[PDB]
Ligand binder design. Structure first.
Ligand SMILES: Nc1ncnc2c1ncn2[C@@H]1O[C@H](CSCC[C@H](N)C(=O)O)[C@@H](O)[C@H]1O
Lengths: 128, 425, 199, 58, 54, 49
């Protein structure tokens, strides 16, 4: 059990994977060309879609989850009436908070600006 | 104050674990958030990689998929989830020929040995990170030299009773006439002892809902057994049924600082003898360790509870930190004293300080006797451990168990001392 | 601290408890008075014997007077003194006094829950069920969980008194508190619903 | 209120400009038609707390 | 960093690492400089005192 | 479009979100009250879109 050398320090067997794992070499690689996809997903809003499902994974009844979200969203707007009207939505703020409560990081209410917007009067036309 | 001007470039016993340890799990959809695995002479352990800022609800620390675990029902019939035993396999007859309530560890040991033989099973890889026969701290592997040094006739008798039960089970089910697929699982009697030791020291019983079925499973979760034990845990185990993921969640509204160890309570409340019998380790701060005492002498526990800022019902005894300010003395060890010490209390009857002072020394007069009963002292044992350099780890645990018990007696001696004088104010 | 200094406290407090346990607050008043004459400042446990003397006889006004004198001196009262105060209030059914003292404990940063259980039990003990509902529900909405006995005791008394409205609300709080209503709790509720005339 | 419901739609603009409990007009109109056929349609809310029966006016 | 009277080897390594401005140099760390190919521990010491004189 | 998105015309969107647009104008002080906002919407100012 306990083993020490002359200096008095403790020497222990470094537990290491003796055998070899096939899947280890087949899964550590990452694709290099998803920069446009990840940017599109965030801009579209599918990042919340995964978060919405993730919350439902730890839930027992999806009808109770939406009632709890609606109840908490109503609580948010009552406290701060002049915050959840435009770029920030009461429901999205609840969802962002509930994800942040799990220990992950999301922007507040999933709100995103347009860094490339030229002027105040220029609104982004959508290419249908 | 620029980063170039700033020049940033202890705990030597703890080294970062093998990266393959997390990698072999990471490929199997195992995610650890904000924590890292560190190993040392004591063993493995999970330590925070960053400050865990508290949130409204519990924060997810680790996730373990069901398929990586070994699970067996606690109640007959014995059905294995992530089913690994094929129908008609002779290992099921060995498992099914076990005591329904006493041989839970044996049924897990058979699965544990069976899993190591399976080529596709994940535990054949994770088994390399399990402690060996010498590294495991279970008392089931200890010999009479460590058991005699343990100095506990009740605990030694129980341990030696288990050794006979486990060894005889191997003899019955691993004779010369077994098929090779069974014989190769336990080539020698010693290996099966190690298998039972791992099963006892790493089983995590829990009520889990798998699909539409709810049951109690003697589970063998990997990466979650590595969490050490503490009666004041900073995290707990939560089973998520929709995706069959076992979540390790830190307590809600609790901050975890950088480098702090993540611990869970293996048992809700138990004495050190139970922990030694099951897990082969003891804690001096156990709030459930007891000591036989004569009922002739008793004190007012309400005064005793308040002087150390202990509040709540006896089922929920706990200490308040900010009220005491610093109070480095108070810990979980003195909380056990609030239960095991003979006490008296009326509706609101105040105690007599002189009578208690007449009894505190009388109480402490007895307290010196138990320490005298053990030939060695609390500091003598820990000094021996530092001087010791070649011995089995079960010997060290046996030293620790009697050392913790002696300190538990030593702790209450000081506890009554400070309590007696503080009663005047 | 002088060696004889603690002896003087022991001699004084060996005698004060006798007066405290003999239910005579008047005699205790001199013990602290000569203790002031002795020169050493009063302590939180010194008022503990003074407080219980009023509590044993039932001097609710005297118990409060001893409390503010402890506050007037300027030290934190002991939790045992605080627990005795609310229990005395519960014995006389003074709900307003009891809740005010409990608010002080939270302002004093103590364990209000354990004292809150005793106050609710005392009101039920003294048949002050209506006042007990006010105290129990307010604590229930806070988030603290009562004991299993208290939930069983409180619900059964309300149903015996035909207070299904409060019993059902209490039962809902118990469900949110982590305890589920067994057959016993539903039987209490049915004892009142069976008389409403609507099957 | 997003229908023929005068009372709720009257203030639903203003709640969404600054930031039920009554039966809809369709049900109230339905009662009158049955009320014209010598049929009395009554909506009661027997309370779950104290079994207090109250008649919801329609 | 051109105006900073750095040794030619120090200057070439910083330019190779796309470090052109003094502000960009300050935002880096000593460890961030050691990881460069032709950069040693002794060089970060002599680099600092050059900045100290300025 | 994405699977969860739909495109609405300006003249249809403004009709559906009449109340919410008025709230935004009042919230950000562009319109003093409801009457100004409704007139402002009919004016079809660039801020309204
Ligand atoms: N709080 C604690 N104090 C001391 N040893 C502990 C402990 N919690 C767990 N252990 C050790 O771990 C065993 C249980 S299995 C836990 C995994 C182990 N800590 C490891 O490093 O691999 C016990 O038998 C004991 O040897």
């Amino acid at each position: 059990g306990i083993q020490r050398d002359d200096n008095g320090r403790r020497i222990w067997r470094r537990r290491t994977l003796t055998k070899k794992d096939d899947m280890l070499r087949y899964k550590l690689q990452r694709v290099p060309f998803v920069e446009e996809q990840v940017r599109k997903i965030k801009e579209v809003g599918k990042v919340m879609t995964m978060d919405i499902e993730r919350l439902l994974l730890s839930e027992d009844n999806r009808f109770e989850f939406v009632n709890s979200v609606a109840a908490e969203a109503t609580e948010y707007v009552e406290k701060n009436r002049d915050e959840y009207g435009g770029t920030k939505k009461a429901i999205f703020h609840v969802l962002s908070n509930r994800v942040n409560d799990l220990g992950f990081d999301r922007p507040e209410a999933y709100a995103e600006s347009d860094p490339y917007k030229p002027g105040p009067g220029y609104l982004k036309e959508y290419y249908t | 104050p620029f980063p170039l001007f700033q020049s940033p470039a202890s705990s030597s016993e703890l080294e970062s674990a093998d990266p393959d340890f997390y990698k072999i799990g990471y490929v199997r959809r195992v995610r650890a958030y904000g924590v890292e695995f560190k190993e040392g002479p004591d063993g493995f352990g999970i330590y925070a990689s960053k400050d865990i800022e508290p949130r409204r609800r519990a924060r997810v620390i680790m996730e373990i998929p069901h398929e990586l675990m070994i699970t067996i029902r606690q109640k007959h019939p014995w059905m294995f989830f992530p089913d690994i035993v094929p129908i008609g396999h002779p290992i099921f007859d060995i498992i099914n020929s076990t005591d329904p309530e006493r041989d839970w560890d044996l049924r897990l040991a058979c699965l544990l040995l069976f899993s190591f033989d399976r080529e596709d099973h994940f535990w054949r890889l994770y088994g390399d990170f399990l402690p060996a026969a010498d590294e495991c701290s279970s008392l089931l592997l200890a010999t009479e030299e460590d058991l005699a040094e343990l100095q506990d006739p009740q605990l030694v008798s129980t341990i030696r009773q288990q050794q006979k039960r486990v060894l005889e089970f191997w003899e019955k089910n691993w004779h010369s006439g077994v098929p090779l697929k069974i014989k190769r699982l336990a080539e020698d009697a010693e290996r099966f002892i190690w298998a039972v030791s791992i099963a006892q020291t790493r089983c995590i019983s829990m009520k889990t809902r798998i699909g539409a079925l709810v049951q109690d499973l003697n589970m063998m979760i990997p990466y979650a057994d590595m969490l050490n034990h503490s009666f004041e845990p900073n995290c707990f185990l939560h089973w998520r049924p929709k995706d069959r993921i076992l979540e390790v969640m830190s307590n809600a509204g609790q901050a975890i600082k950088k480098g702090e160890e993540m611990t869970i309570n293996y048992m809700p409340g138990q004495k050190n003898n139970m922990l030694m019998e099951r897990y082969g380790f003891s804690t001096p701060v156990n709030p459930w360790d007891a000591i036989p005492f004569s009922g002739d002498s008793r004190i007012h526990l309400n005064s005793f509870l308040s002087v150390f800022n202990i509040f709540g019902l006896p089922e929920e005894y706990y200490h308040d930190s900010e009220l005491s300010g610093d109070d480095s003395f108070v810990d979980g060890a003195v909380i056990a004293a609030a239960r095991t010490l003979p006490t008296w209390s009326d509706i609101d009857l105040p105690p007599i300080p002189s009578a208690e002072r007449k009894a505190v020394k009388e109480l402490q007069d007895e307290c010196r006797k138990m320490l005298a009963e053990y030939p060695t002292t609390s500091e003598q044992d820990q000094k021996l451990l530092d001087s010791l350099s070649e011995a089995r780890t079960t010997f060290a645990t046996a030293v620790k168990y009697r050392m913790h018990r002696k300190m538990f007696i030593g702790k209450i001696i000081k506890a009554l001392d400070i309590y007696q004088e503080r009663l005047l104010f | 601290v002088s060696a004889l200094e603690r002896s003087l406290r022991l001699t004084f407090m060996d005698e004060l408890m006798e007066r405290a346990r003999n239910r005579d607050p008047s005699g205790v008043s001199e013990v602290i008075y000569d203790m002031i004459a002795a020169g050493l400042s009063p302590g939180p446990r010194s008022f503990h014997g003074l407080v219980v003397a009023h509590a044993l006889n039932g001097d609710e006004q005297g118990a409060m007077h001893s409390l503010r004198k402890e506050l007037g001196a300027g030290q934190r009262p002991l939790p045992e003194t605080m627990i005795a105060l609310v229990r005395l209030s519960g014995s006389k059914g003074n709900a307003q006094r009891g809740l005010e003292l409990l608010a002080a404990m939270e302002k004093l940063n103590y364990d209000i829950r354990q004292a809150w259980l005793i106050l609710v039990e005392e009101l039920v003990r003294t048949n002050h069920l209506e006042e007990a509902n006010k105290v129990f529900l307010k604590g229930a909405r806070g988030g603290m969980r009562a004991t299993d006995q208290l939930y069983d005791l409180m619900i059964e008394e309300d149903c015996k008194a035909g207070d299904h409205s409060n019993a059902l609300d209490i039962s809902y709080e118990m469900e949110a508190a982590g305890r589920f209503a067994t057959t016993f709790h539903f039987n209490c509720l049915l004892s009142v619903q069976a008389t409403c005339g609507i099957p | 209120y997003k229908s023929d419901h005068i009372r709720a739609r009257q203030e639903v603009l203003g709640t969404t400009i600054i930031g039920p409990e009554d039966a809809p007009e369709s049900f109230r109109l339905l009662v009158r038609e049955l009320r014209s056929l010598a049929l009395e349609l009554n909506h009661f809310l027997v309370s779950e707390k104290n079994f207090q029966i109250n008649r919801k006016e329609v | 960093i051109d105006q900073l009277e750095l040794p030619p080897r120090i200057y070439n390594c910083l330019k190779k690492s796309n470090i052109h401005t003094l502000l960009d140099l300050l935002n880096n760390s000593q460890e961030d400089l050691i990881k460069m190919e032709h950069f040693h521990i002794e060089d970060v010491k002599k680099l600092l005192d050059i900045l100290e004189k300025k | 479009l994405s699977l969860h998105r739909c495109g609405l015309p300006r003249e249809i969107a403004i009709e559906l979100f009449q109340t919410f647009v008025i709230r935004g104008l009042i919230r950000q002080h562009l319109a003093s009250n409801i009457g100004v906002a409704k007139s402002q919407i009919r004016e079809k100012k660039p801020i309204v879109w």
